[PDB]
Ligand SMILES: Nc1ncnc2c1ncn2[C@@H]1O[C@H](COP(=O)(O)OP(=O)(O)OC[C@H]2O[C@H](O)[C@H](O)[C@@H]2O)[C@@H](O)[C@H]1O
Ligand SMILES: O=c1c(O)c(-c2ccc(O)c(O)c2)oc2cc(O)cc(O)c12
């Protein structure tokens with residue numbers, strides 16, 4: 001834990017100049033239009049624009065620690081709002097353009113945005129989620145569960161059980177929840193398009209799931225300000241802020257980014273909404 005390898009921290013950021021950024025986001029649109037099964041992979045980069053620092057960015061938690069400085073939070077977890085990127089992903093699922101969403105984020109924003117939990121793998125856990133050690137029932141709380149490392153929180157299960165509730169935050173030693181990783185793995189293998197957003201892809205095996213898409217000739221898009229572990233495997237690398245990339249993508253797809261109603265939990269995806277007809281792609 002104290003000597004846990006925190007990987008490559010504080011690499012220089014890359015900014016695609018505007019003409020190139022505009023051309024890459026057009027190519028991403030073309031890829032989304034052409035794909036049968038689109039899977040998104042998110043990391044801490046999608047939450048930096050809500051005030052939650054990442055881990056390995058220039059002011060990330062691990063980067064600052066290396067330099068003997070502290071990360072800065074501009075929000076609590078409870079007062080953090082979903083970004084434009086978070087809400088774009090909600091809409092993409094609703095119109096059937098996203099098959100599944102794999103996140104390394106513990107910040108609870110995908111759940112709180114109203115993204116359906118049955119299309120989400122939360123590989124590293126959720127700050128707001130406790131789980132019955134007996135029956136495995138999960139409770140999505142309105143405040144952060146005050147423990148980390150799969151510890152007893154002190155609350156008990158209420159299923160019609162009295163099982164001990166534990167946090168879902170993996171420590172360095174803990175392996176990924178089997179359900180989340182198994183669904184994330186099946187989605188990534190069966191996808192013909194994996195898109196990574198604000199992850200450096202340094203964690204194994206979370207960071208490696210997008211590569212599974214390349215099996216049977218799937219395509220891989222990496223959107224990130226820094227270099228990533230798997231840059232050389234990407235069909236398309238977009239170096240720009242994920243909110244800029246996603247608002248431009250949504251405009252190309254003719255989709256609006258929906259309103260956030262405040263924190264709301266959706267267990268099961270709703271029936272798909274209508275979406276714009278597809279352009280002719282030669
Ligand atoms: N607004 C932004 N737009 C685009 N890219 C961004 C933005 N902000 C940050 N980035 C990029 O976002 C990337 C975020 O990379 P990392 O900080 O490694 O986070 P992870 O989610 O992959 O960390 C994985 C696990 O490691 C930890 O131990 C935990 O257990 C994590 O769950 C950077 O490369 C930024 O350049
Ligand atoms: O529990 C914690 C936590 O999860 C995170 C964290 C950091 C960056 C992220 O991008 C993120 O999603 C979470 O930081 C912390 C920093 C502390 O001083 C104390 C904590 O207890 C946490």
Ligand SMILES: [Zn+2]
Pocket residue numbers: 132133134135136137157158159161162163
């Ligand atoms: Zn129980």
